[PDB]
Amino acid sequence: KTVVVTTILESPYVMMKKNHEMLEGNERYEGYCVDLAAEIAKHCGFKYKLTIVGDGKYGARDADTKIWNGMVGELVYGKADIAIAPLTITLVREEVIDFSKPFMSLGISIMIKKGTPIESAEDLSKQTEIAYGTLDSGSTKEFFRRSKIAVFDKMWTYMRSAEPSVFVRTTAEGVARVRKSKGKYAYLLESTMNEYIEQRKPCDTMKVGGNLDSKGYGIATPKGSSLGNAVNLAVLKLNEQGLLDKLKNKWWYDKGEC
Amino acid sequence: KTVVVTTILESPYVMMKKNHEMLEGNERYEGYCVDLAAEIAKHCGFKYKLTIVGDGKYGARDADTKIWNGMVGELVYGKADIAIAPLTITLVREEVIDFSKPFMSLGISIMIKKGTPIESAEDLSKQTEIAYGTLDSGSTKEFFRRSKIAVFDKMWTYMRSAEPSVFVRTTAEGVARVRKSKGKYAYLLESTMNEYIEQRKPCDTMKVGGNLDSKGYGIATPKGSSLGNAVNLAVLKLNEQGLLDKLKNKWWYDKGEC
Ligand SMILES: CC(C)(C)c1onc([O-])c1C[C@H]([NH3+])C(=O)[O-]
Ligand SMILES: CC(C)(C)c1onc([O-])c1C[C@H]([NH3+])C(=O)[O-]
């Protein structure tokens, strides 16, 4: 009965509340997806338990074992009933799990330490002094791996064989790398996160250029789940009521530090 | 075996080709949705016939008769197998027809004749000199009718009883009204159309302020339709290959013009 929700510790979607060490269950967390989960459960009429994904990954199919990891894996193998996180709707994923219509729109973007002489993806691909990478096991990495667009294919061929590795395990690692590399590392991540980080101290990073593509985040459920329909309608209702815009303003700018 | 596609004459989505009088079938038309339709059909493996919606409407449920009109109506009552056009994904529509994930992201926006002293929805609501309205039988009108955001509800309250009516039968009517009203009429329509018009002669209109909401267009099919799955996957694949961005750049090609 209690719906098992798989999510990921990614600010400001899901974060440990200040006094979390002495809190239990859902009360240990806070964030945009924590609020969204509450709204969805309310509209769909179910109780739930937020559970952080074991491997801390979004979801990718291992070319080798052919096994799915991350939150996608938790759904595919029946460990969770639903995923409420900034999970990107993609073709390979839609083939194994279901997604509600988007609750947020975004696109891949470039994050630089302020002052870095880079304005676009093309700029990056035409130089080698500044390294650049992306997150492991995510849609952004897969985007570059599959891209047939000249500039992106060129960037991928570079990234895939760069040393030391330009790929990071978590968004926090990528942000730290941009911040500590004196402008010698640029990070590729989704726009809304780029935007969120530009609002965090020490306010030394920024988004450059336009988005490389246009996609959306969706609430995912196992293929053919009984929750699919109700969740989808709930997301549409919440968006039309303006709750999603409200949630965005709350966690991004009302709590901004720059 | 031929799929009946319902669509609407709306530039640059679907337009009559030059010399269309001597052409027949699908060859009579050109535009973003015409090209999209060709791509979708190619990926899903089906032949199709483009048909222009009889009442020239997007789709709304008649308050009193309880009857869906426009392209939504054509799907609901079995007149068409699929709708390929700038049809907004909404809750009320999703309750009676199915939508693929969005193939385009956009939002409601404001169109003013250049020079109009208006910069936002709030500016519009705080005055009465400049009349403002929207398209009938569409998602934008329903947005205001149902919005509880003070500003939008305030706008709805004024629009509902203004004289002469601020609502128009077609987009062309609303645009023409902005252009002929010497700045005394502002029009509410979706962003990508506003931007399309802003780049064409006589170059006397412009989009002002940010978008009022965020949403997308989706390819629609009757509820439970067998075509649903394939069309959805096709849209995701086309977006991931960059075809959707290519079509946008093609039909919004900065035409020479302003
Ligand atoms: C952390 C976040 C969300 C900003 C992100 O930035 N680049 C990515 O690949 C992802 C993960 C992506 N949303 C997914 O679902 O794989
Ligand atoms: C004409 C177009 C497409 C610019 C538009 O702009 N405001 C609207 O309401 C619509 C129609 C809407 N997409 C729908 O499906 O009702």
From Swiss-Prot, chain A:
What is expression of this protein induced or repressed by?
Down-regulated in the pyramidal cell layer of CA1 in the hippocampus by global ischemia.
Q: Which tissues carry this protein?
A: Detected in forebrain. Detected in dendrites of neuronal cells. Expressed in the pyramidal cell layers of CA1 and CA3 and in the granule cell layer of the dentate gyrus.
Q: Where in the cell is it found?
A: Cell membrane; Postsynaptic cell membrane; Postsynaptic density membrane
List the residues marked with site Interaction with the cone snail toxin Con-ikot-ikot. 61
Positions bound to L-glutamate: 86, 88, 93
The PTM entry states: Palmitoylated. Depalmitoylated upon L-glutamate stimulation. Ubiquitinated by RNF167, leading to its degradation.
- Taking the record's annotation, the residue ranges forming a coiled coil are none
Subunit structure, as described in the record: Homotetramer or heterotetramer of pore-forming glutamate receptor subunits. Tetramers may be formed by the dimerization of dimers. May interact with MPP4. Forms a ternary complex with GRIP1 and CSPG4. Interacts with ATAD1 in an ATP-dependent manner. ATAD1-catalyzed ATP hydrolysis disrupts binding to ATAD1 and to GRIP1 and leads to AMPAR complex disassembly. Interacts with GRIP2. Interacts with GRIP1. Interacts with NSF via its C-terminus. Interacts with CACNG2, PICK1 and GRIP2. Interacts with GRIA1 and SYNDIG1. Part of a complex containing GRIA2, NSF and NAPA and/or NAPB.
Belongs to which family?
A: Belongs to the glutamate-gated ion channel (TC 1.A.10.1) family. GRIA2 subfamily.
What does this protein's UniProt record list under function? Ionotropic glutamate receptor that functions as a ligand-gated cation channel, gated by L-glutamate and glutamatergic agonists such as alpha-amino-3-hydroxy-5-methyl-4-isoxazolepropionic acid (AMPA), quisqualic acid, and kainic acid. L-glutamate acts as an excitatory neurotransmitter at many synapses in the central nervous system and plays an important role in fast excitatory synaptic transmission.
Q: What is known of its domains?
A: The M4 transmembrane segment mediates tetramerization and is required for cell surface expression.
What does the record's miscellaneous section state? The postsynaptic actions of L-glutamate are mediated by a variety of receptors that are named according to their selective agonists. This receptor binds AMPA (quisqualate) > L-glutamate > kainate.
| Identification of the protein by name | Glutamate receptor 2
Gene source species = Rattus norvegicus (Rat)
Q: Which gene encodes it?
A: Gria2
Covered residues, full protein:
414 to 527 of 883
